[PDB]
Amino acid sequence: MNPYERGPNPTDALLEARSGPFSVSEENVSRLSASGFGGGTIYYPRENNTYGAVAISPGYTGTEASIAWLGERIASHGFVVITIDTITTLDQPDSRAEQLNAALNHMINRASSTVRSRIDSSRLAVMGHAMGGGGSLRLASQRPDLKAAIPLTPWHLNKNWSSVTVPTLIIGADLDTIAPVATHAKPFYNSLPSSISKAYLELDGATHFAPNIPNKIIGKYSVAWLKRFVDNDTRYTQFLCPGPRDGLFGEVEEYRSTCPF
């Protein structure tokens, strides 16, 4: 009925697993093949179909290796995902925004036919870690046609994101000393309009480095957000609404959403 649906009916166990049901192959994007970003890796499902497409940016001083596990894991649930390097490791968030955009266009227009034929260019998403998450917010702001945005422990000097109407899941970490949730992630979530689809999930016992370490919470709710908004897959509403519990015996420090979507 929903022809964007891919994979079997979900459970906590399948969403928390290290790998989804799709086997994954990779396309290397060399620095000189890439226009407007530093190259990276495209993870894509071997099974021929069309899928939504995600661009992910690392943070200050980092490269694609620090978010590789995430590109693999998300692709293994039926998405085409690029993990980018930036032009320099020191690029600022609003520069990372522009480079994420360039990576979306690379996947759609300049990659091999193998990749291009597997992308529904109308269903795109953006993610990023730390300054990359800042880049996520800016691009989401600039491209309200994107289907989802997921800033992970995001970092940005601009705290006002009321121009964002893309469905946005911000993931904060309670022990993050580099982008403390009080001065970044929460003000980001709070300034996003109350009228859009958004959610704030704060990890419990997690540093700035948590998105760089295979993490079953991040993987589960990142895929669920993408399934729900890139594929319009309502089989995944159950994980977002009411969402993870932040109370007694809960899995999360804090979860806040505009459920129902």
Author numbering: 41 to 301
How did the manuscript describe this experimental structure?
Cutinase is an esterase that belongs to the α/β-hydrolase superfamily and primarily hydrolyzes cutin from plants. In addition, the substrate-binding site is more expansive in cutinases compared to esterases, benefiting the binding of bulkier macromolecules.
The WT TfCut contains the combination of His/Phe in positions of 224 and 228 below W195 and this pair fixes the W195-bareing loop and its indole ring in the C-type conformation. This leads to a narrower substrate entering portal (circled in Fig. 4a).
